[PDB]
Design a protein around this ligand. Sequence first.
Ligand SMILES: NC(=O)C1=CN([C@@H]2O[C@H](COP(=O)(O)OP(=O)(O)OC[C@H]3O[C@@H](n4cnc5c(N)ncnc54)[C@H](O)[C@@H]3O)[C@@H](O)[C@H]2O)C=CC1
Ligand SMILES: Cc1cc2nc3c(=O)[nH]c(=O)nc-3n(C[C@H](O)[C@H](O)[C@H](O)COP(=O)(O)O)c2cc1C
Ligand code: SF4
Lengths: 430, 55
Amino acid sequence: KTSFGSLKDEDRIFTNLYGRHDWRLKGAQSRGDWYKTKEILLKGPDWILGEVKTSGLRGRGGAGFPTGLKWSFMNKPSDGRPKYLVVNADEGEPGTCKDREIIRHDPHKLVEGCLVGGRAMGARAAYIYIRGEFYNEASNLQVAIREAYEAGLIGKNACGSGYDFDVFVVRGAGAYICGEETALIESIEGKQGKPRLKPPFPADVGVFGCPTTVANVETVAVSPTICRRGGAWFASFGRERNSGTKLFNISGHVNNPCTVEEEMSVPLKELIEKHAGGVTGGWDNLLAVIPGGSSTPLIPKSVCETVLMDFDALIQAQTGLGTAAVIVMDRSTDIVKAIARLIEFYKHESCGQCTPCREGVDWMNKVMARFVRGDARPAEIDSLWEISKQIEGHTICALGDGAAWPVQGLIRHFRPELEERMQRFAQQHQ
Amino acid sequence: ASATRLIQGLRNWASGRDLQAKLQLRYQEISKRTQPPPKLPVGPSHRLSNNYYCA
Ligand SMILES: NC(=O)C1=CN([C@@H]2O[C@H](COP(=O)(O)OP(=O)(O)OC[C@H]3O[C@@H](n4cnc5c(N)ncnc54)[C@H](O)[C@@H]3O)[C@@H](O)[C@H]2O)C=CC1
Ligand SMILES: Cc1cc2nc3c(=O)[nH]c(=O)nc-3n(C[C@H](O)[C@H](O)[C@H](O)COP(=O)(O)O)c2cc1C
Ligand code: SF4
């Protein structure tokens, strides 16, 4: 297969994403959830890890680490400490609202993923660090976890398999940096949600100093489907090292802002013109696309014509896949004001721990706040580039990376627009 | 420069040189004691980019 997309509804993992069916247990059992979960639990962790490593499932959090290889780091005998699956359900990323849809409309799929993945990693229980702003989604998830307990699917002797497994939900408290896995661990442990340094990677020292795997809602919820349908079924969609299906949030300047499941290596133009109703004013009215949520650098219309929506084709296009959240920006957009607002986000959402992010993201906000009006001279553009290169790679977590990258994308694709902004400021003010 | 041309001619004859052309006492030809404020230039490292000190 060389042309991807046009995914059939029989191949969607996330049936009942739109809330058009019962999200509860009688709805989920009439759609395919909780079917032969015991026969996945009783085939050991090794078969489940083989099915997930075969399926090519990479991290749906946004970095795309191989989820089976990540979960095989827990395949080790215990040292007296328990093991924990922790489901990252924060989703504070701008553009990204898909895990809200998964928790709100397929909760039992996430709970069965918690059970199966925790069997695969030998986990004691599952702490779902849900977002604090997703309150109704959290009570939604707790009602479905109550329905899974009362049916004996989780808890003492989960699904009749001799295996004990609890599912905990910890609400957030309004911090974007608590989506980062070590800061999420610190937020579960009742401290300031500040990211730890790595190593120890959380399979060595994680939550409470236990072995821990933090995994996204999407890469957990697809795991019973990977166990039932098979690894070859999931690897049969998308390119090699770019396997599976993926939820997409197309928002911004489109005619129909939507959440939709789609095949992995789908073209961006096909995705926007099919599921989103096109860009407002047509495809010819396109100026830029932030391809994968706010941290990934933007791409212009000359790149958006033939680009694909997976990891490798966006890394080749000097951006990233990220959360695969498409923020569409038409020709009427002040792009400098939008990216400066995005850097204003990344300094309002920054935990202040280490020097380059704490100082330089505020200093990039100040430089971008002068770039919006144009109250600067062009020797500060390249300067700003160097400042991004002094934050990219020198921080603890990748919010310094996620704050340096949109500045780099705006400079790299719209340096002449910044220069004409500043020179028209300098001519109508001096 | 206030000497009489008799004394000036005697002085030029005695030295053998023209002395009013090259006077050693200074007059209004010298620079003013009050000058306009300067604007001094900066060096090559007064840049905002490609200015790493290790380089
Ligand atoms: N989903 C969301 O809402 C958001 C997602 N992101 C994404 O987060 C990413 C940055 O997060 P990071 O975890 O710092 O990126 P990445 O460098 O660390 O690693 C991703 C995952 O692989 C694991 N890993 C990688 N190498 C490992 C090794 N040798 N041993 C053990 N585990 C290993 C990490 O523990 C982590 O869980 C970005 O790519 C960005 O797109 C950013 C903001 C919001
Ligand atoms: C600043 C920052 C914020 C993040 N926020 C989230 C988040 O809200 N939700 C999420 O699933 N991953 C988030 N991540 C990515 C996680 O670190 C981690 O990669 C992911 O949650 C689990 O990895 P996996 O996708 O391989 O399963 C964030 C990363 C960073 C650097
Ligand atoms: S770089 Fe920013 S987001 Fe990361 S540990 Fe430091 S303050 Fe926190």
